[PDB]
Amino acid sequence: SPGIWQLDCTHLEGKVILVAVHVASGYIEAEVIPAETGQETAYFLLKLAGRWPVKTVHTDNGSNFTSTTVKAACWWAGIKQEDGIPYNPQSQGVIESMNKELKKIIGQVRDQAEHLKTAVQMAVFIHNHKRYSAGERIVDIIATDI
């Protein structure tokens, strides 16, 4: 549980927002990319795994699950790559709710930033600090595990 992350891909302004959610805490990292490719996903996962102890990733779709580049990154970083099938159906709705929430925050900050990527990082900040906070929960969870 402390090492479980879920990938999530959402769209805004003709661009793609790639999100990793730490399932147990709701803590997120996110980036804007031109389109979701195996290459982009692989690089994103490498970044994530260097920063937090990522044991398992539930991939966001079958293309990323199949991607040899994503598989290479998961091998390199010691990540167990799994499907993201919502066997528990309240998963769908929670990811949906998070995308809606993130887009709302992005709209609330959008005019403070020239570029979407900046607004997305502002949204990450607000989400992870919002009150415990998600940032507090992830640290506590991992510390307890260690």
Ligand X SMILES: NCCCCCC(=O)N[C@H]1Cc2ccccc2/C1=C\c1ccc2c(c1C(=O)O)OCO2
24 binds, among Cl ion, ligand X, its own copies, none (CB under 5 to 8 A by kind): none
Report yes or no: 121 and 100 within 8 Å, Cβ to Cβ.
no
Residue 69 contacts which entry, its own copies, ligand X, Cl ion, none (Cβ below 5-8 A, type-dependent): ligand X
The number of residues in the chain equals 146
Stretch that binds ligand X, among 16-24, 25-33, 42-50, 58-66 (CB under 6 A): 42-50
By the rule CB under 6 A, 42 interacts with ligand X: yes
Least distance to its own copies from the beta carbon of 43, Å?
Answer: 7
Under a CB-based contact definition with an 8 Å cutoff, are residues 12 and 116 in contact? Answer: yes
Instruction: Classify 27 as helix, strand or coil.
Output: strand
Distances (CA, A) of 48 to 3, 114, 134: 12, 26, 16
| Residue 124 binds which entry of its own copies, Cl ion, ligand X, none, CB below 5-8 Å type-dependent | its own copies
Q: How far is the CB of 115 from its own copies (least distance, A)?
A: 9
Q: Which residue is nearest to ligand X (CB)?
A: 118
Does 88 bind ligand X (CB under 6 A)? Our answer is no
Q: Considering CB distances under 5 to 8 angstroms, the limit depending on partner class, which of its own copies, ligand X, Cl ion, none binds residue 29?
A: its own copies
Cα 125 to Cα 64: distance, rounded to the nearest angstrom: 26
Pairing of strands 80-82, 15-22: unpaired
Q: What three-state secondary structure class fits 127? A: helix
Give the residue, chosen from 21, 84, 135, 138, that forms a contact with Cl ion under the rule CB under 5 A: 135
The DSSP output letter for 139 is H
In one-letter notation, the amino acid at residue 84 is G
Contact residues toward ligand X (CB under 6 A) are 39, 42-43, 46, 69, 72-73, 76, 111-115, 117-118
